[PDB]
Design a binder for this molecule. Structure first.
Ligand SMILES: N[C@@H](CCC(=O)O)C(=O)O
Length: 255
């Protein structure tokens, strides 16, 4: 009409999940989560309708050695989506190829590991080999270590990229499973660490935030919607709604 916006996203708890129901669920009704509530509110403010699709390869997006992007980032580059509404990290390398709204949530890389060990920081992980560590393949944390010029992070990258078949995981669910079943520490964004540690009293963040950043809504470069989505996010912040959405999905999870 009124064209239907195509939204690309990625299943990731509590941001985007399949809703569980006894009755059959069709289309957007199949999904729930922080990012779906946010999408609803954005569409309430900006007056659009949308069709939610998953990223075909189930990846956030990274650029390979040939310079090629994948994941949700590539979906925007190739104009197969109008918006990525996902816990999608705003980074300088991504900003060269796609546009981002202002952040709807802030976070930094930290460490997820079990409690009760002498590991207090990234340095404690870097100076040893017994405890394996790593990150989600082709996300921004993996890229942060790959591009880092800080020694300890450089040393950590050499370790994870040499052990990449085991050290790099396909998604955060696998990384948490590795932390649970095996001797492994996950480099993970702090908002997700928070979600996990609230649900398993054996797990903890180790050390503080290794960087500081945000999740934003992605659009193709030059999109007219990017600024409009910023304005809508600023209204939700002003209304306290970003706070209530976070509380809803983190502490009192679900509907
Ligand atoms: N939010 C990250 C994914 C998770 C991670 O890389 O730690 C991204 O946009 O790539």
């Amino acid at each position: 009409a009124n064209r239907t916006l195509i939204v690309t996203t990625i299943l990731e708890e509590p941001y985007v999940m399949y809703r569980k129901s006894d009755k059959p669920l069709y289309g957007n009704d199949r999904f729930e989560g922080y990012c779906l509530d946010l999408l609803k509110e954005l569409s309430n403010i900006l007056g659009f309708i949308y069709d939610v699709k998953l990223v075909p390869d189930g990846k956030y997006g990274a650029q390979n050695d040939k310079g090629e992007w994948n994941g949700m980032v590539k979906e925007l580059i190739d104009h197969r989506a109008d918006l990525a509404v996902a816990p999608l990290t705003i980074t300088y390398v991504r900003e060269k190829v796609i546009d981002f709204s202002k952040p709807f949530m802030t976070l930094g890389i930290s460490i997820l590991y079990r409690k009760g060990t002498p590991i207090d920081s990234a340095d404690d992980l870097a100076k040893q080999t017994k405890i394996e560590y790593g990150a989600v393949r082709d996300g921004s944390t993996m890229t942060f270590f790959k591009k880092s010029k800080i020694s300890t992070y450089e040393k950590m990258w050499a370790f994870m990229s040499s052990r990449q078949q085991t050290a790099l995981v396909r998604n955060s669910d696998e990384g948490i499973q590795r932390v649970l079943t095996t001797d492994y520490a996950l480099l993970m964004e702090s908002t997700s660490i928070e979600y996990v540690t609230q649900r398993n009293c054996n797990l903890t963040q180790i050390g503080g935030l290794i960087d500081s950043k945000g999740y934003g809504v992605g659009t193709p470069i030059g999109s007219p919607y990017r600024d409009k989505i910023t304005i809508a996010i600023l209204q939700l912040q002003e209304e306290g709604k970003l706070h209530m959405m976070k509380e809803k999905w983190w502490r009192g999870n679900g509907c």
